[PDB]
Symmetry: C3
């Protein structure tokens, strides 16, 4: 077991609600573990993963959820001001092969520049 | 000498070390929820990141001194030695992992 | 190939982070505010800075700019955070630029 990472961004001003955000700006996706057609990352190497995301907040409160498998694992709520902020979150999640993770915003506007990043830190041995 | 990571969150307010009791990851049990301190068991470079929701100022402590004075966010790299402890003083997460051992 | 990292803290110019939390390899030049790639590979960069500027955006730059969204005009910025993974080639430079604040970068997978 070895490498798995992806870093992606949202170029589109609106997204979408209650569905996986399909980030289209690919900063990195070498092993293509991030599915650009679904906005979901798929775990092919079991291990500890680090995910980091930032959802643009502008004029409207933002509620984001990091989903793993079929459920929301992490929640971020950010009130606006008023100011462009980022509803950010980072977490370590051990993943098994098959586990998919993606983000959702509970049309969501002014989400452009939002980013979703994740990487295999320690592979299971 | 290879794995040491944790990611925990808050299950309440009041944010003395912050005791995060929500465990996202703590496989090597290096993070102690009773004290809220992470204990370095492998010397090396660690990456710490926290997003905490608390006139209030949040600090990341290494050993017994504040490294960072910061919603309150921060990410940093701290080279730690065995015995070194790191702690902090909508989910509010505190995360840390061994990047490079030694 | 294996270690390259820095953690530093504190318009239209690289942000010179002077508070050095880590810079063992010295790949981060505090006089220019830029990180220089010596070991090609996948790097993680994260940041959280206090800006207090209007009609301004914040982004990591690499050979000049990482995420640039073409959008309609609107206004204001107080603090900004981000994180990205970038595969860097030798010679590549990365820095934070507004077109305890922190800026961390680390080589994760070396080519």
């Amino acid at each position: 077991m070895y490498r798995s990472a992806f870093s992606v961004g949202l170029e589109t001003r609106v997204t979408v609600p209650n569905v996986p955000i399909r980030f289209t700006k690919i900063f990195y996706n070498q092993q293509n573990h991030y599915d650009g057609s679904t906005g979901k990352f798929y775990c092919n190497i079991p291990g500890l993963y680090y995910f980091s995301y930032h959802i643009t907040v502008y004029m409207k409160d933002v509620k984001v959820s990091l989903f793993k498998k079929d459920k929301a694992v992490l929640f971020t709520y950010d009130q606006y001001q008023e100011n462009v902020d980022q509803a950010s979150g980072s977490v370590l999640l051990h993943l098994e092969v098959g586990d998919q993770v993606w983000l959702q915003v509970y049309y969501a506007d002014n989400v452009n520049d939002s980013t979703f990043t994740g990487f295999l830190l320690y592979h299971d041995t």
